[PDB]
Each structure stands twice: as structure tokens, then as C-alpha cells.
Amino acid sequence: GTHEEEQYLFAVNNTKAEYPRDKTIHQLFEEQVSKRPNNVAIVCENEQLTYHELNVKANQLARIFIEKGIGKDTLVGIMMEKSIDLFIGILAVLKAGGAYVPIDIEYPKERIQYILDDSQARMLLTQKHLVHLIHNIQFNGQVEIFEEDTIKIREGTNLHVPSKSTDLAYVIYTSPKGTMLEHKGISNLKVFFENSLNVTEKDRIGQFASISFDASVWEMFMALLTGASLYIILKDTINDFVKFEQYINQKEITVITLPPTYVVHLDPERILSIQTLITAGSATSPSLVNKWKEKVTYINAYGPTETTICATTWVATKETIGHSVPIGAPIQNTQIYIVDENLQLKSVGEAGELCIGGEGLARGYWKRPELTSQKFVDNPFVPGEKLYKTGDQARWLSDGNIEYLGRIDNQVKIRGHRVELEEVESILLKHMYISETAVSVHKDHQEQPYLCAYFVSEKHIPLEQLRQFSSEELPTYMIPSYFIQLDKMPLTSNGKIDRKQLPEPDLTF
């Protein structure tokens, strides 16, 4: 026997590539500043800094952090307005040898206290006008106010803090556990941005994502580690689709990463500067991709916070989009294994849990040893390493691409049959008038489960037609018992569907 299938399942993981494995994020930023110090690094409204200017200010502030005890693996909470100053702060924390815990200021008190209490950050960098948000928490550590003439008085050369790439860089909270990411994964991403995405200094990277979501880390360093510029898009521009479209074209943004939940509202014929559109965070669809692939280079990027943002990508080709948009193949220095409950490899085409190995793996969850040992298991494929169990269902396709099948949690039993919520969602989305869908499970008065489909459409779709369509497209046990048209989909801050905001039907008749 030749064991072809088994060999194929390993060949798909031949992704090794050279990258600065011993360098830190700030080291990489500094080496870019040195190459082109006078390149624009960051733009916000009518203000901007060159790589040199940004570097100097980060170095100055970092020297203040050093004296106040910020060092190896020290966590520094950051709570600042979306601005150039926010990014000076992030870089300053990294330069001081510490890690930052981003806290979005648009957040409620409760969340700021969990992050602060859980992370137990010894320092909180914020701004003068935001301190009232702080009077709603039991913080005891050093509260650093960011308005510095204080900073302009310090030396602006690169510091020489003994930092390793295995030191922590940032801690981002996911649905709530704080994920510890080291420098390594970003060092790897730098090379991916250059070699895979083809990002160069000529690019202008939009900064769309919330600072508390790793997509913002993705954008920030996509710009700052390649020599490109980063454009801080403000909330009021984002809250207005026509304003956002105008911003992109006026600022001549070339690369933007957006949630499919956002892109669905944009007109591709209005967008003119975008060269590369990356969607991530949730599933995109054949209809959406078909609508954009001829205008821009469309990339579907998949990955959990736990493996440093991105584990796989798929690029739309001139060719046929099928029933699903693949999440693609593992990026450089990343391995994917689709396995059963005991970590045994599934046959090609079989559904299993997507597990990730490689250079992007997080150190684990902050102060959660047991959950860490449960999710980051010993890698049976590359002994000596760890393997992250994503909780996602997926299957290997024929062509080396991975097909995402939904969260394992979203598998509900109805009438003794197995239903995956995401599958009902994607099928209903095929309807010519439906632009967005979401399916949820609820129990009726006899505690039995039933499906409820929520959809958005420009015009009112008669339920009779939704029922007929479902009858033709879905197995009986997968036909929603109720269809509910929403004016707009309720989203979380990260741009994902907020299931707990979808109205449950009143079964009282």
C-alpha cells in the first residue's frame, strides 16, 4: 500500500517558510523605520506621523514605562480614543518589554472591570478626558495619563530592553477568557503580509476594527511592519456607509479587512481605490464574493484569536464559486488537522473539528491553566508541540482547500435529526431577495426545540414563498418553523451576529 490519502493530509501542511522567528514586533517596526524613516506611518483626519516621528514618540513614552516598572510580560491596559496617540501607546508598551491589554472606550463599565480585574494590569494608560470612565471601577494600579509634553522631554532613540519573541505582546478577550499572544505570531504574519498579500510601502491600510478585536492588530502591523501607512477610520465615518465609501476613495485606501456583515452594505461600483478586500470574522457567501471578485482581489481569511488572528486564507479566482466559499489553506508556518473526538484524522471530505498547529499558537489563556490545557492540547502530529482545538467543524476539499461547516455548538438535534444552524443560514441566503440570514434554536411550551430564521430584505417577502423555497432547498427537519424579517441584523462590537438580540417568537395562540 502507498497510503496516498494520509500522505495528502500531510502534504497540505507543507507550509514552512523563513521568517524572523527571533525578532519582536517593535524590533521589526524599528527595522522598518530605519529603512524608510520618512515614509508616512499613520494618518488620522488632518494629522499624520512619519515612521521616524512615530518611532521617536513611542521610544520617549516607553522610557517612562520603564521607570514605572513596565517590563517582561507586564500587562498594561490601554483605554484611549481611536487616534494616533493610541498607537504610540501600544508601541511604547511593546518597546518597554511589556504586553498591552486593549480596552475599547465605547465599552460598558462591567467589561472594563472584568478586563482590569482578570488581567490584574499594574498600569492603565488612558487620556485626561476619559478618567471618569475609570471612577466606575476598583483599580489600584498606576493610572498613566497620556498627555505628554512629559514625553517630548525624553530621549527618542531605540531602547534596548532584553526582549524575546516568546514574550507576550498582547492579551485580547474572547467570549470571557483573555488570550495571551506572544511576539512570534506577528513576526510570522509580517512575512505573510509581504509574500502572500503582496503588501508594500505604497499601500494604505484602513484601520477599521475595534482595538479590542485582533483584527485591529492585523491592520496595525499590516501597515507598520511593511512600510505602508495606517489610516485610523473614526466611528462616525464607519456608522455611515456612504461616508465610509467616500473615505476609502478619498484617502485612496488600497487594502481593507472587513466583516462580511459590513461589506454586504457597501457598493463595489462605488469603491474605486481598494485593490485587496479581505473579509474575516464570519462566513462570507458565493453571492457576496461573486459581487466583488471582479473589482478587487477578494480574500477570505479565517482564524481564531488563539492562533494569532489568521490560520487560513482563500483567494477568489476567475473560476466557479460553489455552494460555499472555502476558508482556504493554512498560511505559512501553520498546520491544520481535521479530526474526530480523539484527535484521529478524518478522511478527506469527512467533517471533523478543525485543529490548528504552528507558529501562531497563543501561550494560552491568562490565569486559566485548566481551560488552557483543554484547548491547547499536546500535538500528536508534531510531537513536542501544542495543538489548538478551535471548536469549529470543517472538512478538507479535493483541491487542498478547507470548507468551514460552522461552530460545533451550533449543531442542534431537531426531531431526532442533526441540524447545523450555519447550513440553514447559507441555504436561505441563496434566495434572490435575501441579503442576510441568521437562524436560532428555541424551545416551545413543551420544551421541544424549533428553528427560527431571521432575514433582511429590501422588500417584504411573503412567508408563503419562504416556505415554498425552504421546501425545495432544505430537508423537512431543517425547514424553519418561523421566519422573521428584521430591518437590520443585530451585531456585536466585533461585527458578528448577536444571537441574544434576535427576537424569540411569542407562541401564545
Ligand X SMILES: Nc1ncnc2c1ncn2[C@@H]1O[C@H](COP(=O)(O)O)[C@@H](O)[C@H]1O
Ligand Y SMILES: N[C@@H](Cc1ccccc1)C(=O)O
Number of residues that bind ligand X (CB under 6 A): 16
Interface stretch with ligand X, choices 299-307, 340-348, 393-401, 424-432 (CB under 6 A): 299-307
Give Cα 339 to chain centroid, integer Å. Answer: 24
Among 174, 273, 287, 411, binds Mg ion (CB under 5 A): 174
How many Å apart are CA 250 and CA 43, to the nearest integer? Answer: 13
Interface stretch with ligand X, choices 142-150, 191-199, 266-274, 279-287 (CB under 6 A): 279-287
Dihedral angle of Cα 326, 331, 333, 339, to the nearest 10 degrees = -10
| Residue 498 and residue 506 in contact, taking contact as beta carbons nearer than 8 Å | no
| 407 lines the binding site for ligand X (CB under 6 A) | yes
Among 302, 376, 396, 455, binds ligand X (CB under 6 A): 302
Among 98, 304, 326, 360, binds ligand X (CB under 6 A): 304
Rank residues 40 and 301 by Cβ distance to ligand Y and give the closer one. Answer: 301
| 305 lines the binding site for ligand X (CB under 6 A) | yes
Interface stretch with ligand X, choices 60-68, 160-168, 302-310, 445-453 (CB under 6 A): 302-310
| 492 lines the binding site for Mg ion (CB under 5 A) | no
Which secondary structure element, helix H or strand E, spans residue 390, and what is its range?
A: strand 386-396
Across the beta sheet with 168-174, the strand order is 142-145, 123-126, 75-79, 99-102, 168-174, 177-182, 364-365
| 305 lines the binding site for Mg ion (CB under 5 A) | yes
User: Please, what is the minimum distance in Å from the beta carbon of residue 34 to ligand X?
Assistant: 34
Q: Residue 218 touches which of ligand X, Mg ion, ligand Y, none (CB < 5 to 8 A by kind)?
A: ligand Y
| 185 lines the binding site for ligand X (CB under 6 A) | no
User: Please, what is the minimum distance in Å from the beta carbon of residue 335 to ligand X?
Assistant: 16
Rank residues 97 and 260 by Cβ distance to ligand X and give the closer one. Answer: 260
Written as nine digits, the cell of 380 is 500528536
Within 10 A of 270 (CB to CB), how many other CB atoms are there?
12
- Tell me how many degrees the CA angle 177-179-184 measures, rounded to the nearest 5: 175
Rank residues 15 and 142 by Cβ distance to ligand Y and give the closer one. Answer: 15
How many Å apart are CA 300 and CA 317, to the nearest integer? Answer: 12
Binding stretches for ligand Y (CB under 6 A): 214-215, 218, 257, 280-281, 301, 303-305, 309-310
Q: Residue 175 touches which of Mg ion, ligand Y, ligand X, none (CB < 5 to 8 A by kind)?
A: ligand X
| 280 lines the binding site for ligand X (CB under 6 A) | yes
Secondary structure class of 417 (helix, strand, coil): strand
Q: Residue 215 touches which of Mg ion, ligand Y, ligand X, none (CB < 5 to 8 A by kind)?
A: ligand Y
DSSP state letters, 309-363: S-SEEEE--SS---SS---BEE-TTEEEEEE-TTSPBPPTT-EEEEEEEETT---
Q: Residue 398 touches which of Mg ion, ligand X, ligand Y, none (CB < 5 to 8 A by kind)?
A: none
3-class secondary structure per residue, 423-448: HHHHHHCCCCCEEEEEEEEEECCCCC
Contact residues: Mg ion, CB under 5 A: 174, 304-305
Contact residues: ligand X, CB under 6 A: 174-175, 280-283, 300-302, 304-305, 327, 390, 392, 404, 407
